Symmetry: C3
Amino acid sequence: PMFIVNTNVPRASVPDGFLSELTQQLAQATGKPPQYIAVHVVPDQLMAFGGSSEPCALCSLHSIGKIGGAQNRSYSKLLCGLLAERLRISPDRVYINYYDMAAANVGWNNSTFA
Amino acid sequence: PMFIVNTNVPRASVPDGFLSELTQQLAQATGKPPQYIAVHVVPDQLMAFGGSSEPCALCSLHSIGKIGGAQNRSYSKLLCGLLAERLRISPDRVYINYYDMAAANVGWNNSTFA
Amino acid sequence: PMFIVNTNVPRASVPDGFLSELTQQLAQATGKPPQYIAVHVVPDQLMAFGGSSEPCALCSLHSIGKIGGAQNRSYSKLLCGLLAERLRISPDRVYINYYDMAAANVGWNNSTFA
Protein backbone atom coordinates (compact mmCIF):
# COMPACT_ATOMS: atom_id res chain seq x y z
CA PRO A 1 0.00 0.00 0.00
CA MET A 2 1.03 3.59 -0.59
CA PHE A 3 -0.21 6.68 1.15
CA ILE A 4 0.56 10.22 0.00
CA VAL A 5 -0.36 13.40 1.85
CA ASN A 6 -0.06 16.83 0.21
CA THR A 7 -0.63 19.72 2.57
CA ASN A 8 -0.15 23.49 3.01
CA VAL A 9 0.96 22.90 6.60
CA PRO A 10 4.66 23.85 6.87
CA ARG A 11 7.49 21.29 7.14
CA ALA A 12 8.29 22.36 10.75
CA SER A 13 4.76 21.39 11.78
CA VAL A 14 5.21 17.73 10.65
CA PRO A 15 6.35 15.90 13.83
CA ASP A 16 9.45 13.75 13.87
CA GLY A 17 8.26 10.16 13.59
CA PHE A 18 5.18 10.97 11.52
CA LEU A 19 6.32 8.76 8.62
CA SER A 20 6.82 5.82 11.02
CA GLU A 21 3.45 6.36 12.69
CA LEU A 22 1.70 6.36 9.31
CA THR A 23 3.59 3.22 8.29
CA GLN A 24 2.64 1.38 11.49
CA GLN A 25 -1.00 2.47 11.54
CA LEU A 26 -1.56 1.66 7.84
CA ALA A 27 0.07 -1.80 8.32
CA GLN A 28 -2.47 -2.37 11.04
CA ALA A 29 -5.44 -0.95 9.17
CA THR A 30 -4.74 -2.71 5.86
CA GLY A 31 -3.48 -5.95 7.39
CA LYS A 32 -0.40 -5.74 5.17
CA PRO A 33 3.15 -6.10 6.45
CA PRO A 34 4.94 -2.79 7.13
CA GLN A 35 7.66 -3.76 4.68
CA TYR A 36 5.11 -3.21 1.87
CA ILE A 37 3.82 0.13 3.12
CA ALA A 38 5.12 3.27 1.46
CA VAL A 39 4.39 6.76 2.77
CA HIS A 40 5.02 10.20 1.33
CA VAL A 41 4.38 13.56 2.97
CA VAL A 42 4.53 16.82 0.99
CA PRO A 43 4.28 19.96 3.20
CA ASP A 44 4.43 23.64 2.30
CA GLN A 45 2.10 23.24 -0.63
CA LEU A 46 0.23 25.98 -2.43
CA MET A 47 -3.34 24.71 -2.14
CA ALA A 48 -6.87 25.62 -1.26
CA PHE A 49 -9.90 23.72 -0.13
CA GLY A 50 -13.25 25.41 -0.68
CA GLY A 51 -11.38 28.57 -1.78
CA SER A 52 -9.64 28.81 1.61
CA SER A 53 -5.96 28.41 2.40
CA GLU A 54 -6.54 27.38 5.97
CA PRO A 55 -4.83 24.05 6.73
CA CYS A 56 -5.96 21.27 4.40
CA ALA A 57 -4.79 18.00 2.89
CA LEU A 58 -5.24 16.15 -0.37
CA CYS A 59 -4.30 12.52 -0.08
CA SER A 60 -4.26 9.15 -1.81
CA LEU A 61 -4.24 5.58 -0.63
CA HIS A 62 -3.42 2.94 -3.27
CA SER A 63 -3.63 -0.70 -2.37
CA ILE A 64 -3.93 -4.05 -4.11
CA GLY A 65 -7.24 -5.01 -2.57
CA LYS A 66 -8.35 -4.04 0.97
CA ILE A 67 -10.31 -1.13 -0.58
CA GLY A 68 -14.09 -0.93 -0.40
CA GLY A 69 -17.07 0.79 1.21
CA ALA A 70 -16.63 -0.13 4.87
CA GLN A 71 -12.86 -0.35 4.77
CA ASN A 72 -12.54 3.11 3.22
CA ARG A 73 -14.83 4.60 5.91
CA SER A 74 -12.58 3.10 8.50
CA TYR A 75 -9.40 4.30 6.79
CA SER A 76 -10.90 7.78 6.54
CA LYS A 77 -11.64 7.92 10.29
CA LEU A 78 -8.11 6.72 11.04
CA LEU A 79 -6.28 9.04 8.64
CA CYS A 80 -8.37 12.12 9.31
CA GLY A 81 -7.76 11.40 13.00
CA LEU A 82 -4.01 11.30 12.49
CA LEU A 83 -3.99 14.45 10.31
CA ALA A 84 -6.08 16.31 12.93
CA GLU A 85 -3.99 15.16 15.89
CA ARG A 86 -0.53 15.47 14.28
CA LEU A 87 -0.93 18.21 11.67
CA ARG A 88 -3.88 20.11 13.20
CA ILE A 89 -5.93 19.80 10.01
CA SER A 90 -9.65 19.68 10.30
CA PRO A 91 -11.18 16.46 9.00
CA ASP A 92 -13.57 18.50 6.87
CA ARG A 93 -10.62 19.97 5.00
CA VAL A 94 -9.22 16.53 3.98
CA TYR A 95 -9.88 14.57 0.79
CA ILE A 96 -8.53 11.03 0.46
CA ASN A 97 -8.78 9.34 -2.92
CA TYR A 98 -8.79 5.51 -2.64
CA TYR A 99 -7.53 3.29 -5.45
CA ASP A 100 -7.98 -0.46 -5.63
CA MET A 101 -5.04 -1.34 -7.89
CA ALA A 102 -4.93 -4.51 -10.01
CA ALA A 103 -1.78 -6.50 -9.14
CA ALA A 104 -0.83 -6.42 -12.84
CA ASN A 105 -0.95 -2.59 -12.68
CA VAL A 106 1.63 -2.19 -9.91
CA GLY A 107 5.29 -2.40 -10.77
CA TRP A 108 7.88 -3.32 -8.13
CA ASN A 109 11.31 -4.91 -8.21
CA ASN A 110 11.66 -5.24 -12.01
CA SER A 111 8.26 -6.85 -12.42
CA THR A 112 4.62 -6.46 -11.27
CA PHE A 113 2.71 -7.96 -8.38
CA ALA A 114 0.65 -10.19 -10.71
CA PRO B 1 -13.49 18.07 -7.20
CA MET B 2 -9.72 18.18 -6.84
CA PHE B 3 -7.54 19.86 -9.46
CA ILE B 4 -3.76 19.57 -9.34
CA VAL B 5 -1.35 21.32 -11.63
CA ASN B 6 2.36 20.49 -11.74
CA THR B 7 4.46 22.85 -13.83
CA ASN B 8 8.01 23.94 -14.58
CA VAL B 9 6.91 27.57 -14.61
CA PRO B 10 8.52 29.33 -11.62
CA ARG B 11 6.56 30.32 -8.49
CA ALA B 12 6.93 34.07 -9.20
CA SER B 13 5.18 33.55 -12.54
CA VAL B 14 1.99 32.22 -10.85
CA PRO B 15 -0.18 35.37 -10.46
CA ASP B 16 -1.80 36.41 -7.23
CA GLY B 17 -5.33 35.12 -7.11
CA PHE B 18 -4.73 32.06 -9.26
CA LEU B 19 -6.00 29.47 -6.80
CA SER B 20 -9.23 31.42 -6.26
CA GLU B 21 -9.72 31.80 -10.01
CA LEU B 22 -9.30 28.06 -10.45
CA THR B 23 -11.71 27.37 -7.59
CA GLN B 24 -14.35 29.73 -9.00
CA GLN B 25 -14.12 28.58 -12.58
CA LEU B 26 -14.12 24.88 -11.73
CA ALA B 27 -17.24 25.37 -9.52
CA GLN B 28 -18.91 26.91 -12.51
CA ALA B 29 -17.78 24.36 -15.05
CA THR B 30 -18.51 21.30 -12.92
CA GLY B 31 -21.68 22.58 -11.28
CA LYS B 32 -20.26 21.66 -7.88
CA PRO B 33 -20.40 24.07 -4.95
CA PRO B 34 -17.14 26.03 -4.45
CA GLN B 35 -16.84 24.68 -0.90
CA TYR B 36 -16.08 21.21 -2.32
CA ILE B 37 -13.47 22.34 -4.83
CA ALA B 38 -9.84 21.75 -3.89
CA VAL B 39 -6.96 23.11 -5.96
CA HIS B 40 -3.22 22.58 -5.78
CA VAL B 41 -0.52 24.28 -7.82
CA VAL B 42 3.06 22.98 -7.83
CA PRO B 43 5.55 25.30 -9.65
CA ASP B 44 9.31 25.00 -10.23
CA GLN B 45 9.06 21.37 -11.27
CA LEU B 46 11.71 19.35 -13.06
CA MET B 47 9.71 18.15 -16.07
CA ALA B 48 9.59 17.81 -19.79
CA PHE B 49 6.94 17.46 -22.44
CA GLY B 50 7.95 16.01 -25.79
CA GLY B 51 11.58 16.06 -24.53
CA SER B 52 11.48 19.82 -24.13
CA SER B 53 11.76 21.81 -20.97
CA GLU B 54 9.80 24.78 -22.43
CA PRO B 55 6.77 25.68 -20.24
CA CYS B 56 4.42 22.75 -19.69
CA ALA B 57 1.88 21.36 -17.25
CA LEU B 58 0.78 17.94 -16.06
CA CYS B 59 -2.54 18.02 -14.32
CA SER B 60 -5.35 15.97 -12.86
CA LEU B 61 -9.01 16.60 -12.21
CA HIS B 62 -10.78 14.16 -9.90
CA SER B 63 -14.51 14.49 -9.41
CA ILE B 64 -17.41 12.38 -8.11
CA GLY B 65 -19.33 12.35 -11.36
CA LYS B 66 -19.39 15.29 -13.82
CA ILE B 67 -16.71 13.48 -15.86
CA GLY B 68 -17.34 12.39 -19.44
CA GLY B 69 -16.50 12.99 -23.10
CA ALA B 70 -18.25 16.37 -23.59
CA GLN B 71 -17.68 17.63 -20.09
CA ASN B 72 -13.95 16.78 -20.25
CA ARG B 73 -13.60 18.66 -23.59
CA SER B 74 -15.14 21.66 -21.96
CA TYR B 75 -12.91 21.42 -18.87
CA SER B 76 -9.86 21.11 -21.09
CA LYS B 77 -10.79 24.30 -23.01
CA LEU B 78 -11.29 26.16 -19.75
CA LEU B 79 -8.17 24.91 -17.98
CA CYS B 80 -5.84 25.15 -20.96
CA GLY B 81 -7.21 28.67 -21.45
CA LEU B 82 -6.36 29.63 -17.86
CA LEU B 83 -2.90 28.02 -18.01
CA ALA B 84 -2.16 29.89 -21.27
CA GLU B 85 -3.48 33.24 -20.09
CA ARG B 86 -2.11 33.13 -16.52
CA LEU B 87 1.03 30.96 -16.73
CA ARG B 88 1.86 31.45 -20.45
CA ILE B 89 1.83 27.70 -21.10
CA SER B 90 0.87 26.63 -24.57
CA PRO B 91 -2.23 24.42 -24.61
CA ASP B 92 -0.36 21.76 -26.59
CA ARG B 93 2.06 21.35 -23.75
CA VAL B 94 -0.60 20.48 -21.24
CA TYR B 95 -1.92 17.04 -20.23
CA ILE B 96 -4.92 16.72 -17.91
CA ASN B 97 -5.85 13.31 -16.56
CA TYR B 98 -9.57 13.03 -15.63
CA TYR B 99 -10.83 10.66 -12.95
CA ASP B 100 -14.49 9.88 -12.21
CA MET B 101 -14.25 8.85 -8.54
CA ALA B 102 -16.78 6.51 -6.92
CA ALA B 103 -18.32 8.19 -3.88
CA ALA B 104 -17.20 5.15 -1.79
CA ASN B 105 -13.58 5.84 -2.88
CA VAL B 106 -13.38 9.44 -1.60
CA GLY B 107 -12.74 10.04 2.05
CA TRP B 108 -13.75 13.33 3.67
CA ASN B 109 -14.64 14.37 7.23
CA ASN B 110 -13.95 11.00 8.90
CA SER B 111 -16.05 9.07 6.42
CA THR B 112 -16.64 8.71 2.64
CA PHE B 113 -19.23 10.22 0.34
CA ALA B 114 -20.90 6.80 -0.01
CA PRO C 1 2.26 8.83 -21.97
CA MET C 2 3.18 10.57 -18.72
CA PHE C 3 5.71 9.24 -16.20
CA ILE C 4 6.17 10.70 -12.80
CA VAL C 5 8.73 9.77 -10.23
CA ASN C 6 8.77 11.01 -6.64
CA THR C 7 11.92 10.23 -4.70
CA ASN C 8 13.90 11.04 -1.54
CA VAL C 9 17.10 11.12 -3.58
CA PRO C 10 18.44 14.71 -3.57
CA ARG C 11 18.26 16.93 -6.63
CA ALA C 12 22.09 16.97 -7.01
CA SER C 13 22.02 13.19 -7.40
CA VAL C 14 19.75 13.32 -10.49
CA PRO C 15 22.22 13.17 -13.41
CA ASP C 16 22.26 15.58 -16.30
CA GLY C 17 20.28 14.16 -19.15
CA PHE C 18 17.93 12.07 -17.02
CA LEU C 19 14.64 13.56 -18.26
CA SER C 20 15.73 13.03 -21.88
CA GLU C 21 16.78 9.46 -21.17
CA LEU C 22 13.37 8.74 -19.62
CA THR C 23 11.66 10.39 -22.58
CA GLN C 24 13.64 8.36 -25.10
CA GLN C 25 13.31 5.02 -23.35
CA LEU C 26 9.58 5.39 -22.71
CA ALA C 27 9.03 6.33 -26.40
CA GLN C 28 10.71 3.11 -27.28
CA ALA C 29 8.96 0.97 -24.72
CA THR C 30 5.46 2.31 -25.36
CA GLY C 31 5.83 2.65 -29.12
CA LYS C 32 4.56 6.25 -28.89
CA PRO C 33 6.48 9.15 -30.44
CA PRO C 34 8.72 11.09 -28.03
CA GLN C 35 6.80 14.27 -28.80
CA TYR C 36 3.86 12.77 -26.81
CA ILE C 37 5.90 11.62 -23.81
CA ALA C 38 5.88 13.74 -20.68
CA VAL C 39 8.21 13.13 -17.71
CA HIS C 40 8.38 14.62 -14.24
CA VAL C 41 10.99 13.98 -11.54
CA VAL C 42 10.40 15.18 -7.97
CA PRO C 43 13.53 14.79 -5.78
CA ASP C 44 14.19 15.64 -2.11
CA GLN C 45 10.89 14.14 -0.96
CA LEU C 46 10.01 13.21 2.58
CA MET C 47 9.14 9.53 2.21
CA ALA C 48 9.60 6.03 3.53
CA PHE C 49 9.35 2.61 1.98
CA GLY C 50 8.78 -0.33 4.29
CA GLY C 51 9.42 1.87 7.35
CA SER C 52 12.83 3.16 6.17
CA SER C 53 14.28 6.16 4.35
CA GLU C 54 16.98 4.70 2.19
CA PRO C 55 16.59 5.72 -1.43
CA CYS C 56 13.15 4.86 -2.81
CA ALA C 57 10.71 5.93 -5.51
CA LEU C 58 6.96 6.16 -5.93
CA CYS C 59 6.01 6.49 -9.54
CA SER C 60 3.13 6.51 -12.03
CA LEU C 61 2.85 5.73 -15.72
CA HIS C 62 -0.32 6.91 -17.46
CA SER C 63 -0.89 5.89 -21.06
CA ILE C 64 -3.78 5.67 -23.51
CA GLY C 65 -3.55 1.94 -24.09
CA LYS C 66 -0.20 0.07 -24.14
CA ILE C 67 -0.93 -1.01 -20.52
CA GLY C 68 -1.34 -4.64 -19.58
CA GLY C 69 0.20 -7.63 -17.83
CA ALA C 70 3.19 -8.31 -20.05
CA GLN C 71 3.77 -4.74 -21.09
CA ASN C 72 3.74 -3.53 -17.47
CA ARG C 73 6.34 -6.19 -16.49
CA SER C 74 8.52 -4.91 -19.29
CA TYR C 75 8.06 -1.27 -18.28
CA SER C 76 8.89 -2.15 -14.70
CA LYS C 77 12.17 -3.85 -15.74
CA LEU C 78 13.12 -0.86 -17.84
CA LEU C 79 12.19 1.82 -15.29
CA CYS C 80 13.54 0.03 -12.26
CA GLY C 81 16.73 -0.48 -14.27
CA LEU C 82 17.01 3.24 -15.00
CA LEU C 83 16.22 4.26 -11.42
CA ALA C 84 18.87 1.81 -10.12
CA GLU C 85 21.55 2.79 -12.61
CA ARG C 86 20.95 6.57 -12.54
CA LEU C 87 19.57 7.31 -9.07
CA ARG C 88 21.01 4.29 -7.20
CA ILE C 89 17.58 3.23 -5.99
CA SER C 90 17.14 -0.43 -5.31
CA PRO C 91 14.41 -1.97 -7.47
CA ASP C 92 12.80 -3.41 -4.36
CA ARG C 93 12.23 0.10 -3.10
CA VAL C 94 10.28 1.21 -6.12
CA TYR C 95 6.51 1.15 -6.76
CA ILE C 96 5.07 2.13 -10.15
CA ASN C 97 1.32 2.54 -10.50
CA TYR C 98 0.11 1.95 -14.11
CA TYR C 99 -3.01 3.62 -15.45
CA ASP C 100 -4.68 2.76 -18.77
CA MET C 101 -6.38 6.08 -19.53
CA ALA C 102 -9.46 6.35 -21.76
CA ALA C 103 -8.75 8.83 -24.58
CA ALA C 104 -11.86 10.81 -23.49
CA ASN C 105 -10.27 11.09 -20.00
CA VAL C 106 -7.08 12.84 -21.16
CA GLY C 107 -7.15 16.53 -21.85
CA TRP C 108 -4.66 18.16 -24.21
CA ASN C 109 -4.65 21.24 -26.44
CA ASN C 110 -8.10 22.61 -25.38
CA SER C 111 -9.82 19.27 -25.97
CA THR C 112 -9.34 15.54 -25.24
CA PHE C 113 -7.69 12.75 -27.18
CA ALA C 114 -11.07 11.14 -27.99
